Amino acid sequence: LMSLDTALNEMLSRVTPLTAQETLPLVQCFGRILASDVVSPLDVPGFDNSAMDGYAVRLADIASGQPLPVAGKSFAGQPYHGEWPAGTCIRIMTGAPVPEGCEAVVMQEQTEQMDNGVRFTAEVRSGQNIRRRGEDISAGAVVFPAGTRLTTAELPVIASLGIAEVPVIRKVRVALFSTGDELQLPGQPLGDGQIYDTNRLAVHLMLEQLGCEVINLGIIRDDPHALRAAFIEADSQADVVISSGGVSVGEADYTKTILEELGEIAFWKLAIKPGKPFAFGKLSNSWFCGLPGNPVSATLTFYQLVQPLLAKLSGNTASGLPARQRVRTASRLKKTPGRLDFQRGVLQRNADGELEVTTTGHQGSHIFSSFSLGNCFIVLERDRGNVEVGEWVEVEPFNALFG
Amino acid sequence: LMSLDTALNEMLSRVTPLTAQETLPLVQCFGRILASDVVSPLDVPGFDNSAMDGYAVRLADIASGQPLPVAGKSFAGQPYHGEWPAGTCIRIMTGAPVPEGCEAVVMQEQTEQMDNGVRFTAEVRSGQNIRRRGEDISAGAVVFPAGTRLTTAELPVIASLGIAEVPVIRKVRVALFSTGDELQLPGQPLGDGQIYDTNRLAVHLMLEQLGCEVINLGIIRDDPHALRAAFIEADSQADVVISSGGVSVGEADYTKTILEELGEIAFWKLAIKPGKPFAFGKLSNSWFCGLPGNPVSATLTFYQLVQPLLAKLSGNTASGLPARQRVRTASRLKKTPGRLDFQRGVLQRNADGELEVTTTGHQGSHIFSSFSLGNCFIVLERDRGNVEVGEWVEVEPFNALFG
Prior knowledge:
- The structure is a homodimer.
- Chain A is α/β, with parallel strands linked by helices.
- Chain A has helices spanning 4-14, 59-63, 155-159, 199-209, 224-237, 254-262, 295-313, 369-373; strands at 21-25, 38-39, 49-50, 54-57, 70-74, 89-92, 104-107, 111-114, 117-120, 130-131, 142-144, 165-169, 173-179, 183-184, 195-196, 213-220, 240-243, 264-269, 272-273, 277-282, 287-290, 325-329, 340-349, 355-359, 376-380, 392-397.
């Protein structure tokens, strides 16, 4: 009944990004959020340098129209600090700092070498081939603003400014547990209707790959005392508390009252598939996210709901939800109007090199294989009905969490 | 001069994937390559259960034709217990175990639920709507073959089988260093023709994000004895040695002779842009990859050549290279025949909800900004010339290394 979009916006609207920060060497900053703007302590380039390989000359020396001999050479790591007499030019390479008095640089193309010096074939105007210092980055300028997630694209640049460490927002702490006498750990036989806990591992892995600091409390016994203790512990040491399954997501039971008791939790019924129920609210010192017990549902819900909540909490200002694109289906998709169906598919190129999606197979939540077989979600509109081969469909490629 | 594909193909043909292994608890296996086939200890599902919400029936009872009174129900965690009188049906839900003797399940939508029984009119086929024990995974079957990179898609499935740990191939160890008197560390003012070492950090970051174990030896002093010692140290403890800059990639100097003295190293001239040079070869106990000093070229080269090399080395059997797709340029692209130009672009959805690339701006290798501003590579074919707006283009979306 409640739309995903409405649920998302309600959650996020309530959240305040972390501000706590720590300063780390750049090599430790991958995927981290800059806590403060990175302001350039220098100019890039530093010294006006040559745009190409050629000769640094003077407009007066060129005037003589006489083949002027090379008084010396200036290289990137070997700036020329020599004499540079009247009728002479300075051999230079790109990036190499331009010698004092330079007015322009000429490429070795518009230049011909004679026994009495370089003879300039073309015209030479001031500024020519000279990279103006600080033209790419001026000292005192903001290179990267606070909120930027540091990547291989940004970190090397910060290093290029001679900066060793930058301040980053601390990692989001996420407490995680599951509960239910039916949940069993590996190596232990499956009791009556016991199953192996899988949601907890799934969430744990995703949290870690999202750069969160995970506090896994494991499986909490179906006991008010154990559950309440877990909640109090989690809430006291993390920013987000997640029940990977076992805690009520609507149905009344002792877990639900502990919930109602420790915070203001809403029990949503989302117009999505797979899944539907999702618990969310403020605990005393944390945000709580309760996932349905079904593995496919829990994974999907986490991916479409908790992930963007964590993104906001992190301080990341990269406003937006994962890229989606219109694509044709090579597959017939069964779809019931009424729910935004996040089916799984395989995005691939057809003979003509165009992208297309095929179903992974059965879309039931009784199996998990679709996550491995697939590489994307086929996000079928809420009101949409069955999809025939060739129809335009919205596709959202899986992120790194699924490979 | 030499084609990227040819270079890459040749590099990969010489490499043998690591085999050394370690057994780790599933939570520590993200991104890791399965060392041995994961065999299923159980049947999935574990018992015959219903594919739908409906009624469990017997072919003979339907054959009788009279409405079938509901004798009971079987749900999720509670199979149907007690006798199943003849001429009756058991109410059932998806996933619930099918009652003893059940030969078929009929979806409620095909039935007329009346006060004195359920009227069945549709033909009923034996086995219909019954999910048989082990139809998804049968005990003794390989669930994931050795070579599989473990993700949130695979790990939870392994957990569901009650398996706590799996054998994964050890991380590829990569020794990293750069050299040159110009190279400066952060915090220290730039000397004569000095610059801040940025390639090393870049490579380090990627290596780590690629799951490799990095041995960063730092900046080696411009000395043959120091360099020689560096190689020895690097080669003795790593599977791969990478010079992020400073060691010769073709040009003769003291570094090139050390290279020639410590192993069989090829100095390639790649028909690509940016970049061109790349040193590759077998050292005594490792593979060596030497990158050009230009930041843009080094990153690109690492990205398009070293990354794939590391992937094969890891034992990952996932065949293929980064995903590419045909897209229209919303930008005119300056392209020169001769080199495979990996320009940086911005792939985004247009008004018509269609995907399209825009150049990030100046494509020169003197600036690093294009990696931050872009989100993809516009892979302009070697022979291709200038590209006019609206032309079909190859795009390779950036992977996580750049966000």
